Design a binder for this molecule. Structure first.
Ligand SMILES: Nc1nc2c(ncn2[C@@H]2O[C@H](COP(=O)(O)OP(=O)(O)O)[C@@H](O)[C@H]2O)c(=O)[nH]1
Lengths: 447, 85
């Protein structure tokens, strides 16, 4: 019904984000940079750590249940040089040949099979560390071909090796229209495999996150190192129900059960309230959540063309009042649109503000986050669509990326590419069918 | 020792018998006792922790426990037979 979770970084994007994640998690549980408890031990609070994410030793050191992979060994090292004792290097690995690393396609897809044993040895050793295992969570970028290729080979390998486990990822694509021409093969292929696993992902283009970081932090010079903070608050809060569990959610299996009824459409679009990751909204518990639906604070391309929702999940944290939020739920119900097919209950949990954070001067500074399954999420990587359409439709660049003796024949390259485009189109076919009411009659009226 | 103190305080008012001063002692005695009692209930008998625990287990306040219990007990519960070991 739940179990332990091993996280994964694959490519430098997950290391830059990863240092923000680990820093915030360390604050959340008084872990420190060396991984050791920073608290006097009073032997109180059963949720003083999260068994699912850390391995606690005799020093009260919390070893992350995580594996770090990159193609750039200096990024792995710099995160290890930040987590100065916290992140244990035995689970890190670099997938690299300096010559292949600059080739986003070849680096990832060649290592995914060539180095499958190095990739798997860290993974299999950690999964076997426990009995009550639930799943994996990866930090990625479809643009990050290193991650696309090893991630794709793991998506398929882990589905086969561990048929009942949960395999997911958070994937950040750069908000760039022309820098994605060269990415036309690895980003579409990342999708070619992401669509194959119903647990796979929460997706974002960093478009609004970049603009958000430039308005909220006192730093208009928007960059990744000033935007990964926003990524950190949105991803850190996801597991609040695991880290500080209550009744409905304690695990990914539970979250899954209520958020993605259709294994086919697992791709989510995130948003958040002000946060303290790097913040005090000044509103009631119902107002802070209503703002989560406002696209101007969407973390991805903002305004959607009247998006149809298939399922919305929210978590509210702070002095939450069920009656106040009833105004919010009523109001959200009149903004969220759907066919009777997706007229599901919306699910909102209540999380907990960690006891190891600076005491909140006002408990009513309620924060929160939203994850939603919408038809217009396909617009998140529209920039990739623009360039892969130009490229794939022409049979452009077949093996001009030095395919690693896989599909070495140009037709075979085009056939792999065709499958990746079949996936792009089938993704929207399911999002459109999902907008139908008749979807329900197909297996209820008919036999 | 507590009693000895109060015994003396009440004994010392035998000349008044039942009166205002007696009542004053009673009011204070009560407060001292209850305040005491409630420290030991929580400090020695873990009274609030017990209460929270009951909520957490019988009212199922914490589901990680219940999930762990059911899954480990899946064969126990699944087995239809009574007199399981
Ligand atoms: N948000 C974020 N995006 C990144 C970061 N590093 C790279 N990217 C993005 O990831 C894509 C390229 O992937 P990258 O991880 O650099 O290549 P890889 O090492 O082969 O996996 C592009 O969309 C980049 O904008 C990062 O630290 N944070």
């Amino acid at each position: 019904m739940g179990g332990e979770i091993i996280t994964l970084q694959a490519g430098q994007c997950g290391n830059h984000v990863g240092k923000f994640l680990w820093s915030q998690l360390a604050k959340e549980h008084a872990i420190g940079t060396d991984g050791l408890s920073q608290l006097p031990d009073s032997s109180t609070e059963r949720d003083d750590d999260t068994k699912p994410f850390f391995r606690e030793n005799s020093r009260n050191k919390f070893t992350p249940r995580a594996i770090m992979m990159d193609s750039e060994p200096s990024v792995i090292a710099d995160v290890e040089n930040t987590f100065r004792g916290f992140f244990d290097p035995r689970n890190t690995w670099v997938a690299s040949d300096g010559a292949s690393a600059g080739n986003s396609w070849a680096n990832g897809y060649d290592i995914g099979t060539r180095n499958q044993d190095d990739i798997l040895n860290k993974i299999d050793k950690e999964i076997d560390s426990t009995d009550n295992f639930e799943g994996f969570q990866l930090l990625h970028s479809v643009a990050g071909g290193t991650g696309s290729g090893l991630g794709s080979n793991l998506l398929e390998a882990l589905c086969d090796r561990y048929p009942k486990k949960i395999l997911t990822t958070y994937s950040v694509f750069p908000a760039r229209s022309s820098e994605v021409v060269v990415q036309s093969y690895n980003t579409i292929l990342a999708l070619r495999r992401l669509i194959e696993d119903s647990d796979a992902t929460v997706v974002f283009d960093n478009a609004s996150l970049l603009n958000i970081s430039g308005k909220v932090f006192r730093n208009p010079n928007i960059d990744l190192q000033h935007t990964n903070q926003l990524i950190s608050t949105i991803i850190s809060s996801v597991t609040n129900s695991i880290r500080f569990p209550s009744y409905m959610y304690s695990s990914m299996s539970s979250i899954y059960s209520t958020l993605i009824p259709s294994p086919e459409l697992h791709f989510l679009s995130p948003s958040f309230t002000p946060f303290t990751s790097d913040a005090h909204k000044g509103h009631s518990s119902y107002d802070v959540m209503l703002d989560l639906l406002d696209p101007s604070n969407s973390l991805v391309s903002t305004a959607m063309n009247n998006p149809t929702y298939f399922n919305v999940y929210n978590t509210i944290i702070g002095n939450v009042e069920p009656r106040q939020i009833s105004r919010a739920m009523t109001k959200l119900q009149q903004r969220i649109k759907f066919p009777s097919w997706s007229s599901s209950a919306m699910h909102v949990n209540i999380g907990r503000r960690s006891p190891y954070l600076p005491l909140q001067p006002n408990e009513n500074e309620v924060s929160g986050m939203m994850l939603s399954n919408m038809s217009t999420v396909v617009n998140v990587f529209e920039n990739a669509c623009n360039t892969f359409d130009k490229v794939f439709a022409k049979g452009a660049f077949l093996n001009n990326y030095n395919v690693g003796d896989l599909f070495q024949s140009m037709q075979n390259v085009q056939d792999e590419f065709a499958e990746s485009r079949e996936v792009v189109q089938s993704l929207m076919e399911d999002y459109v069918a999902a907008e139908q009411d008749s979807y329900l009659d197909d297996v209820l009226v008919d036999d | 020792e507590f009693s000895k103190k109060y015994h003396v305080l009440y004994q010392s008012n035998s000349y008044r018998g039942i009166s205002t001063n007696f009542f004053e002692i009673i009011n204070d005695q009560y407060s001292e006792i209850v305040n005491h009692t409630n420290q030991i209930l929580n400090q020695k008998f873990h009274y609030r922790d017990v209460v929270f625990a009951l909520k957490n287990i019988l009212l199922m306040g914490k589901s990680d426990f219940m999930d762990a219990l059911i899954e480990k007990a899946n064969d126990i519960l699944a087995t239809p037979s009574d007199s399981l070991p």
